[PDB]
Amino acid sequence: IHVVPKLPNSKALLQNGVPNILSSSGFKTVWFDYQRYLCDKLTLATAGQSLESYYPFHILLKTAGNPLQSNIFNLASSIHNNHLFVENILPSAKTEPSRLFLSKIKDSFNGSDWEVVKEEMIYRAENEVLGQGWLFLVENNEKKLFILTSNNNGTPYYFPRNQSFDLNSAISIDEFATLKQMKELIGKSTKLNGKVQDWTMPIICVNLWDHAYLHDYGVGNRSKYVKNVLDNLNWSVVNNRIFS
Amino acid sequence: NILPPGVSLPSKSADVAAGLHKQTGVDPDYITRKLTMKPLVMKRVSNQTGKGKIASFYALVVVGDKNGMVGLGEGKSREEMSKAIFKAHWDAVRNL
Amino acid sequence: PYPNLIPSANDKPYSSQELFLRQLNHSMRTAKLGATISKVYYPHKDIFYPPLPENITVESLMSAGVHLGQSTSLWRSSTQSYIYGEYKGIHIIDLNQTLSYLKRAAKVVEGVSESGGIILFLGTRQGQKRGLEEAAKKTHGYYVSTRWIPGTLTNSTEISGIWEKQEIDSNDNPTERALSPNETSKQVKPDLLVVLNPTENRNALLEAIKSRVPTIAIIDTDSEPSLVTYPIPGNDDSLRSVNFLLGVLARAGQRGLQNRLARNNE
Amino acid sequence: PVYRLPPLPRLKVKKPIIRQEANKCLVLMSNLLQCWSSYGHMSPKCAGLVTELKSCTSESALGKSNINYHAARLYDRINGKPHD
Amino acid sequence: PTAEQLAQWEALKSVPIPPRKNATLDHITNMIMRHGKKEKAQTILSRALYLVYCQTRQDPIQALEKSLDELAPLMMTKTVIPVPLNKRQRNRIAWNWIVQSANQRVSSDFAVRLGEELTAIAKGTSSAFEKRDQIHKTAIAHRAYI
Ligand SMILES: [Mg+2]
Numbered sequence: 021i022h023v024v025p026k027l028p029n030s031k032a033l034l035q036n037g038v039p040n041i042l043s044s045s046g047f048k049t050v051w052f053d054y055q056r057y058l059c060d061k062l063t064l065a066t067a068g069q070s071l072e073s074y075y076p077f078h079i080l081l082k083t084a085g086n087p088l089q090s091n092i093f094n095l096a097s098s099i100h101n102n103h104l105f106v107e108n109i110l111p112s113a114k115t116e117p118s119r120l121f122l123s124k125i126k127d128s129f130n131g132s133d134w135e136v137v138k139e140e141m142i143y144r145a146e147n148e149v150l151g152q153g154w155l156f157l158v159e160n161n162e163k164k165l166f167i168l169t170s171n172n173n174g175t176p177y178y179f180p181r182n183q184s185f186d187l188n189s190a191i192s193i194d195e196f197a198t199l200k201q202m203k204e205l206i207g208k209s210t211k212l213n214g215k216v217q218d219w220t221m222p223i224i225c226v227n228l229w230d231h232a233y234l235h236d237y238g239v240g241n242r243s244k245y246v247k248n249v250l251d252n253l254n255w256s257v258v259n260n261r262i263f264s
Numbered sequence: 265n266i267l268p269p270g271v272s273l274p275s276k277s278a279d280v281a282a283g284l285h286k287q288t289g290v291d292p293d294y295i296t297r298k299l300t301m302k303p304l305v306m307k308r309v310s311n312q313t314g315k316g317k318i319a320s321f322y323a324l325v326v327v328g329d330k331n332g333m334v335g336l337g338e339g340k341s342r343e344e345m346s347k348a349i350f351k352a353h354w355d356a357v358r359n360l
Numbered sequence: 361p362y363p364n365l366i367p368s369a370n371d372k373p374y375s376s377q378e379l380f381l382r383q384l385n386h387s388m389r390t391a392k393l394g395a396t397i398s399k400v401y402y403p404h405k406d407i408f409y410p411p412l413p414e415n416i417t418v419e420s421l422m423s424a425g426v427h428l429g430q431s432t433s434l435w436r437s438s439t440q441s442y443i444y445g446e447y448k449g450i451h452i453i454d455l456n457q458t459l460s461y462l463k464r465a466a467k468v469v470e471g472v473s474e475s476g477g478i479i480l481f482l483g484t485r486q487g488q489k490r491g492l493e494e495a496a497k498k499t500h501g502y503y504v505s506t507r508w509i510p511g512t513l514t515n516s517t518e519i520s521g522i523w524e525k526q527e528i529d530s531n532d533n534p535t536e537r538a539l540s541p542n543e544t545s546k547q548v549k550p551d552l553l554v555v556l557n558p559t560e561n562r563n564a565l566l567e568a569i570k571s572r573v574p575t576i577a578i579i580d581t582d583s584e585p586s587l588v589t590y591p592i593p594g595n596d597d598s599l600r601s602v603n604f605l606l607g608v609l610a611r612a613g614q615r616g617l618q619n620r621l622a623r624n625n626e
Numbered sequence: 627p628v629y630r631l632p633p634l635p636r637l638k639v640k641k642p643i644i645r646q647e648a649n650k651c652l653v654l655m656s657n658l659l660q661c662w663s664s665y666g667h668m669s670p671k672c673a674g675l676v677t678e679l680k681s682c683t684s685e686s687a688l689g690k691s692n693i694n695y696h697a698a699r700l701y702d703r704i705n706g707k708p709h710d
Numbered sequence: 711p712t713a714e715q716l717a718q719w720e721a722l723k724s725v726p727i728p729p730r731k732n733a734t735l736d737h738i739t740n741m742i743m744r745h746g747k748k749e750k751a752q753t754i755l756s757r758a759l760y761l762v763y764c765q766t767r768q769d770p771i772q773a774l775e776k777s778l779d780e781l782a783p784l785m786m787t788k789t790v791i792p793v794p795l796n797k798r799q800r801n802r803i804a805w806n807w808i809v810q811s812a813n814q815r816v817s818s819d820f821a822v823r824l825g826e827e828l829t830a831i832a833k834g835t836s837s838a839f840e841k842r843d844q845i846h847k848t849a850i851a852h853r854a855y856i
Contacts, residue, residue, distance in 0.1 A: 022395035059395050073402070076394035099394035107393065127370070162373045219379055221386055260389060263374075263382040270541060287517050288571075289547055436709045582709060652856060655785055655794045659853035667846055679784055683794040 021067070022059045022076070025103065027051070028113045038109055040252045041245070046236040051106055054231040058102065062095040076100045077177075084178045085215045093181065094173040101154050101173070104225035105232075108257045115255035121223075121262055128165040137167075138250045141226075144169050145246050149228050150186060155246065157224035159262065165223065176222040180206055223261050224253065276346075277301070280353050288358065298329045301353050304336075306345065321345045323352040327360070335360035406600065407494050410607025412615070413466040418455045421462075424604040426594040429453045429581035436582045442593035443581065451581040458593045462605060465576045465590040466612035469552065473499050474616035476530075477551030481606070482508060482564055485557050491603040491610075492556075499613030500532055502550070513567040516547040530624040549573060554609060556602050559583050578605060630706065637701040642691035651689040654679045734775060737798060741805055754821045761825030766832055773832040778804045781831065781838055783845040792849040792856055807838035 027033055037047040062079075066072045071079050071092065079096035083089040122134060129137045137157075145155045148169040156168040156176040168176055174183030180202060185195050209216050226249050233245035267273065277299075281292035307322040320342050328334040337356025341347035368375050374382060401423070411420070421427065429443065429451035444454035472479060479501035481492045492503040512519050525544055527537045553568050555561045558577035565587045568575045574589040578596040585591045595601040658679055661672035682689050711719075735755065743751035759770035766773060782800030785792045795803070812820075812827035830836060 021398045021400070023398050025393070025396050062395065073397065073400050075392050075397065077391045096394075103393040103395075104390065107390075161379060163370065219374070219383070221382070263378070263385055286542075286545055287515075287547055289549065433706075434709070651794050655792065656853065656856050658784070659792065659850050659856070662846070662850050663853065667843065667850065676784065679794065680779075680797075683784075684797045687794045687796045687799070 021072075022063045022099070024052075024055045024059050027106070027110065029111065032111070038252075039111060041109055041248045042232075043236050046232075049235055050227065050229075050232045051102070054229075055099065055102055055106075058095055058099045062092070062099060065092050065095060080175055080181075081178065084175070084181050085213050093175075097173040097175045097181075101175070101225055102227060104222055105154075105227040108224060108254045108261075109249060109252065110254055110257075112254070113256070115253075115259075117255050118259040118262070120264065121255075121259060124159075124163065124165050124262070127163075138247075141167050141250060142243055142246055145226070145228055146243050148184070148186075150189075152230065153228045155224075155226040155228055156222045158220050158222050161219040168220075176220060176225070177218060178216075179218050179220065180216065221261070224250075224258055226250065276350055276353070280350065280357060284354060284357055290357070294329075295357055299327050299357065300330070301325050301327045301356065303349060303352070306349075309340075318342065321348040323348040325349060325352040325356050327353065327356040333360050403600065403603075406603045406607050407491050410604070410611045413463050413608055413612055416459060416462065416608060418459060421455045421458055421594075421604070424601045425598045426458055426601040426604065427453045427455050428595045428598065428601075430597075431581075434582045436584060439579065439581055439583065439585055439593070442579065442585070453581070453593045453595070461590070461592045462594075462608060465554075465592050466609050468574070468576065468590055469499075469554070469609045470612040470616035472552045472616070473501070473613040474620050475551075476620060478502065478548070479552045479554070479613060480504070480550040481554050481556075481610075482561060483556030483602070483606075484508060484560060485599075485602075487599050488556055488602060491606045495606050495610035495613070498610050498617075500617055501613065508561055508564045510563045511567070512564075513549060513571040513573065516549070517545070520548070521545055531621060552576065554606075555588075556606060557596050558588060559596070562587075576609070578602065633705070633707060634701070637697040637705075638694050639691075639697070642693050644691050649688055651679070651683045651687065654682055732771070734778070734797075734801060735771065737801055738774075738805055741802065754824065757821035758825035758828055761822065762828045762832060765826070765829045768832075770828075770832075774828060777808075777828065777831045781807060781836065781842055783842050783849075785849045786845055787848045787852050790852050790855065792852055804838070807841055808836075811836060811838055 033044075033047055034052070035044060037044040042050065062076065063072075066079065071082065074082065076096040076099040080093050080100060083093040083096065086093075117134060125132065125134055125137055129140070132140075141155060141157065144167050145153075149155065149171060151171075153169060153171045154174065154176075156170065157165055158168050158176045159165055168182060169184055170176065171183045171186055175181050185191060185199065206214060206216060226246055228242065228246070233242050237245045277296050278292075281295035284290050284295065285292045303323060303325045305322070305324040308319055309322050310317045310319045320340050321344065323339045323345065325337050325339070326334065327337065335356040336359055337352040337354065339348040339351025339353070339355060341351065362381065365377060365381075368378055406424075427444070431450050432446050435451060442453055442457055444452045446452065469479065479496075479499050481495050481501060481503040483492050483503075483505055484507060489505040492505050495501065496503040509519050521544075525539060525548060527535045527539065529535055549571055550573055552575070553564065553573050554576040555564055556578055558565055558579065559582060565575060565577070567573075569587075576590040576592065577583070577588040578594045578601075579585050579588070579591040580594070580596045583596070585593075592605060594605055654675060658672060658675040661675060662669060665671045739748065739751045739755050742754055759774065762770040762773060778801050782804035783795065784800070785794045786803075787793075808827060808831065809824070811831075812823040815823040815826060817823050817826075827836075831838075
């Protein structure tokens with residue numbers, strides 16, 4: 021069975037939610053109900069199988085390349101993502117970005133400030149994620165921090181399942197060429213499962229699902245919610261997520 | 265002198281007791297001062313082999329302390345009756 | 361922490377070793393995020409977290425497969441009283457009796473370890489080495505898993521007489537005293553022999569009988585119960601069942617050892 | 627019907643038969659000689675065979691069962707003998 | 711390593727190692743040789759091939775190799791089953807036939823006799839073709855016993 025993790029200061033979380041982002045009934049919707057819903061579904065989709073012994077991160081890595089297990093992958097992704105996000109907005113387990121994080125921002129985002137990159141993240145989430153998705157600030161193997169936007173339950177770890185492009189609507193030739201290159205690179209792998217190496221790891225994660233903002237913000241105003249999230253990150257966690 | 269380490273310069277019941285204490289942890293003092301051996305049968309058996317008849321000495325002995333402990337032992341030696349009786353005494357103490 | 365590693369330069373990417381350490385940092389912190397796993401069997405935990413004898417239920421013996429006996433065509437009828445019935449062409453072992461015998465044998469192991477006696481764990485089937493080694497190491501005991509040399513007890517001088525021996529104090533602390541050749545040459549007989557596969561270890565059982573060593577064994581549907589002092593009816597063919605019973609006995613021995621050290625520290 | 631055997635001193639095959647793979651050289655030679663018998667000697671219709679023959683016999687003109695081991699290893703386990 | 715020597719090694723990466731000797735010519739000369747007088751055998755062979763070149767004006771070594779490949783029988787019946795022959799055995803048979811033919815000629819010098827025999831063979835005039843045909847015919851007749 022997969023069980024929802026116990027959070028630090030759960031009583032305060034149930035009484036007053038997360039200050040400056042979520043009310044009590046908002047955090048209950050996004051964690052104490054959504055995470056329970058996802059863990060129950062994952063348990064029902066993996067019980068009596070090998071995957072029941074693995075953590076959601078390992079499940080999503082194992083099932084990422086198998087088309088028919090996509091539903092499990094989705095669950096295993098959202099669960100994982102939903103705890104990456106909650107963990108880095110929890111009040112505590114005044115935190116400030118580390119020198120290393122800001123140094124890597126200056127070395128990645130054209131020597132820009134952190135607030136400018138925050139505004140870029142607001143813009144990226146506003147445009148490239150129609151409906152449900154996730155916003156990430158991720159570190160590649162090149163020590164480069166970049167902004168990644170996944171639709172629905174795409175993962176930041178494995179690029180063939182990023183789901184960063186909405187193919188329901190029209191796409192630019194640049195995006196199509198990107199997809200073609202990624203398809204060729206996937207075909208380049210020799211492993212019979214057809215998997216590839218991808219060392220991208222998430223530094224910051226924001227939940228753009230309606231379970232996070234809809235109750236407290238409204239149908240619009242997701243930009244306000246994302247702004248509140250990024251202005252009130254738990255920088256102890258975010259600083260620990262960067263390799264020293 | 266050039267005595268090798270582990271060598272000594274230059275009765276049977278004593279050697280039986282020492283060997284059996286080393287091999288089985290039984291008390292040597294009891295064996296030496298409270299057991300009496302009595303040979304029961306002493307035979308020459310023989311085996312026919314392609315190179316002639318090979319004779320062996322066979323000894324069946326009994327040992328005991330006259331206090332409810334008794335043991336039979338058999339020993340066999342192609343060289344001497346002393347050796348067959350020694351092995352029989354050994355076996356008898358082991359079978360107490 | 362990680363000596364003789366040369367970091368990379370900020371201009372250049374992560375190296376393979378830097379990537380390894382980076383994903384280790386990820387693994388210990390964030391890889392386990394999302395859900396905690398409950399009520400799922402992990403094979404290693406039978407060895408490192410065996411339960412106490414008092415906490416064992418029939419259900420946990422059954423989940424380990426201890427109840428699954430030999431084919432009814434290979435029945436040794438002297439094991440009749442241990443059997444619960446037959447199901448799917450095999451005999452089922454009565455796990456109530458298994459639990460009672462297991463608690464008795466565990467108490468014997470605990471008592472012998474508490475008295476500072478020597479405990480030997482014998483199992484010569486394929487993948488039993490890990491459990492035997494861990495049982496020995498947590499009981500301050502001894503084990504064999506490769507092969508039982510016939511005569512290891514009844515011919516100890518010719519076999520085990522050459523290997524080294526050691527004087528130890530009440531706390532099992534090496535004294536590093538020099539032993540005499542006579543002391544080194546003596547037999548050092550186990551105080552308790554526990555055999556995981558007694559059917560393939562008749563030599564050891566007979567030697568223990570001759571050498572007068574009490575013995576514990578896992579007795580399957582084809583094994584002779586009277587050849588051991590303290591039988592445990594159970595499946596001797598499954599590594600899970602064998603490791604469950606062995607871990608129980610090893611923990612009982614560990615508790616006996618802990619009690620001995622406790623009073624020797626008071 | 628099942629015919630169980632009594633306890634045997636052994637379980638051994640007297641002369642185990644093995645996989646004697648045929649030599650490619652001899653097969654090529656037979657095909658070439660058949661070709662010469664049918665289509666005439668030094669016929670061009672199977673010069674390829676000649677070439678292949680020349681290629682295969684060039685350096686060398688010519689280009690054990692384990693049943694008893696496993697039978698001896700497993701006999702005691704599978705013989706279905708009653709317990710002692 | 712220096713760059714010039716790295717370049718040399720790169721250049722030789724692709725080149726195959728040259729052969730120490732021509733195995734076929736080595737075999738033929740060793741078949742001519744007696745009493746370890748190799749230089750004399752090599753002189754005889756090279757002089758015969760010189761005559762072959764001078765009368766045909768082609769690479770005499772290639773002509774010799776074509777001659778030996780064509781004249782030698784591919785298989786032979788032995789005690790009666792056909793058996794295939796390897797290249798060395800074929801060259802031995804063909805060379806023995808060639809020497810027997812050459813020793814029917816008039817010159818006192820063996821090099822001249824051998825050279826003009828090899829010239830005649832290079833122009834498709836040799837009685838040993840009949841020997842090859844007879845051997846092949848026997849092999850065909852006994853193909854059933856392979
Ligand atoms: Mg069994």
